[PDB]
Amino acid sequence: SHGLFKKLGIPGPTPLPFLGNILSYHKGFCMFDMECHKKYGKVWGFYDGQQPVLAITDPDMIKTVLVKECYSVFTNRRPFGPVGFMKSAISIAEDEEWKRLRSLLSPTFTSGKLKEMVPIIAQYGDVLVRNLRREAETGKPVTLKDVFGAYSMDVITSTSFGVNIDSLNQDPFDPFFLSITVFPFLIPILEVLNICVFPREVTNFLRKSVKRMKESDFLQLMIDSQNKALSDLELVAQSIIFIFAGYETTSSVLSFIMYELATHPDVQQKLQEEIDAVLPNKAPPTYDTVLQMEYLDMVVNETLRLFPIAMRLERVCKKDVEINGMFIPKGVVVMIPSYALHRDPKYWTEPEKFLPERFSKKNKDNIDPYIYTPFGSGPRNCIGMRFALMNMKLALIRVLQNFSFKPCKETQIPLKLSLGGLLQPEKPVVLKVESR
Ligand code: HEM
Numbered sequence: 249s250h251g252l253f254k255k256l257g258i259p260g261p262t263p264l265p266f267l268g269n270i271l272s273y274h275k276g277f278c279m280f281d282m283e284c285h286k287k288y289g290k291v292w293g294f295y296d297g298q299q300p301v302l303a304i305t306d307p308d309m310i311k312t313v314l315v316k317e318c319y320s321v322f323t324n325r326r327p328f329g330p331v332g333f334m335k336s337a338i339s340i341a342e343d344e345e346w347k348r349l350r351s352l353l354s355p356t357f358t359s360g361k362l363k364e365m366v367p368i369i370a371q372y373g374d375v376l377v378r379n380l381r382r383e384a385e386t387g388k389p390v391t392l393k394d395v396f397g398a399y400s401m402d403v404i405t406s407t408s409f410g411v412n413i414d415s416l417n418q419d420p421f422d423p424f425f426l427s428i429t430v431f432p433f434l435i436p437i438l439e440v441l442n443i444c445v446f447p448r449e450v451t452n453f454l455r456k457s458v459k460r461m462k463e464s465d466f467l468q469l470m471i472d473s474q475n476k477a478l479s480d481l482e483l484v485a486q487s488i489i490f491i492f493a494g495y496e497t498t499s500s501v502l503s504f505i506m507y508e509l510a511t512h513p514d515v516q517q518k519l520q521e522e523i524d525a526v527l528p529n530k531a532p533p534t535y536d537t538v539l540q541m542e543y544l545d546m547v548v549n550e551t552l553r554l555f556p557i558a559m560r561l562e563r564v565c566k567k568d569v570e571i572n573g574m575f576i577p578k579g580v581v582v583m584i585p586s587y588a589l590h591r592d593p594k595y596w597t598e599p600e601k602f603l604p605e606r607f608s609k610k611n612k613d614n615i616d617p618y619i620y621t622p623f624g625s626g627p628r629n630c631i632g633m634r635f636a637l638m639n640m641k642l643a644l645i646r647v648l649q650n651f652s653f654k655p656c657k658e659t660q661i662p663l664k665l666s667l668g669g670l671l672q673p674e675k676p677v678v679l680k681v682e683s684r
């Protein structure tokens with residue numbers, strides 16, 4: 249089984265018995281992907297253990313995979329376990345079951361459901377300020393992910409359920425998952441053991457805490473179809489997904505943006521200037537004033553080009569296909585190396601520099617949406633994209649209407665990415681905060 253790509257004529261690095269190419273992850277997914285993209289061109293293959301993985305980078309082939317042939321051939325992501333009752337979570341679910349959850353949960357993030365959440369988000373930003381005004385009136389460097397995650401947790405639990413809890417001081421969220429991929433034949437062993445990559449105690453906290461809400465929103469819109477069709481432990485699982493997403497991703501990106509705003513002071517001023525012009529007198533941001541702000545959008549986009557928190561997009565090939573003139577056999581994992589495409593010199597001038605002018609309306613048309621895919625694409629892209637962009641931007645507006653951000657002696661400059669598996673910084677993001 250380590251001969252597949254040698255036979256297909258697809259180039260790629262030579263695998264070791266059993267491990268495949270996984271020793272190559274010692275420097276991280278993204279470095280390996282960049283290295284392959286440059287050694288091998290537009291297409292290559294490698295092996296996670298015994299699992300063949302075909303990397304593609306052609307914009308047309310990517311659109312075919314994410315969009316043109318999604319329902320028919322590339323419907324699911326790579327199996328990932330042991331998951332337990334979380335198998336029914338939307339982003340883990342497969343084929344017809346995912347289809348049903350997608351259709352069931354899509355009405356949560358409309359322009360009209362988002363627009364109802366702006367008045368309610370508007371409270372925790374003010375908490376976020378006062379929490380920050382304290383750690384500022386005392387010239388003590390601030391950990392952004394702590395105070396951002398605090399605010400993120402606040403918005404999520406209320407956007408979907410209705411629970412309000414000053415997020416300060418709950419909040420429960422590469423050593424072993426390694427063995428999953430040399431030993432994925434061990435996943436079904438672990439499922440029959442109830443063994444879970446979510447420690448059985450974090451989920452047991454909510455295997456009742458959702459039943460405990462309450463009862464007598466995302467939570468609302470689910471019961472209406474609970475009363476085919478719908479369930480309830482399946483309701484707790486969707487909730488856990490949403491609660492992770494809104495906490496960890498929203499807070500992690502906010503921290504990346506503030507780092508870049510701090511290492512590029514002219515961009516921070518330019519942004520504070522735009523916010524005060526749309527929102528004079530520190531006017532409260534509304535749903536519409538957020539979408540009005542173009543440089544805020546450019547800043548956000550440009551951070552997600554540098555720090556795309558998914559790193560790779562993946563789809564299981566569920567049957568033989570010949571896409572854009574190339575044969576792909578059943579079972580291959582097809583992979584888009586997003587981090588690499590975001591930093592590819594053959595699309596982006598000076599790709600390591602934080603330059604938000606790449607996304608000006610003057611320039612944003614030179615940007616292939618199948619190269620720059622921070623939220624995915626096609627029927628299976630990020631279901632929370634608009635809620636996420638809006639959530640962050642309201643945090644940013646409120647925050648920058650009050651404070652500026654400078655580097656500190658301990659600010660890691662330049663910021664190293666974690667060689668681990670998740671797009672995080674090695675050292676946490678600390679910066680000096682000053683009150684306008
Ligand atoms: C800046 C924040 C976020 C980013 C960059 C992001 C990005 C992504 C990406 C790249 C995917 C995979 C798409 C694909 O494979 O084509 C995804 C999937 C998903 N995201 Fe997010 N996301 C963010 C925040 C959120 C939030 C706040 C939610 C809240 C519900 C959310 C819910 C989901 C779900 C449910 C999926 C699975 C979609 C499916 O399998 O049908 N995401 N996200």
Ligand SMILES: CC(C)(C)OC(=O)N[C@@H](CS[C@H](Cc1ccccc1)C(=O)NCCc1cccnc1)Cc1ccccc1
Pocket residue numbers: 328339340489490492493497557558560561630669670
């Ligand atoms: C750990 C590793 C990076 C190797 O592979 C995973 O990423 N595996 C997840 C399985 S689930 C799903 C998948 C996903 C999401 C975004 C991009 C690519 C793949 C998911 O939407 N997750 C919920 C929150 C979220 C995160 C990012 C963007 N949008 C939403 C990790 C996971 C498992 C169980 C609970 C929470 C997270």
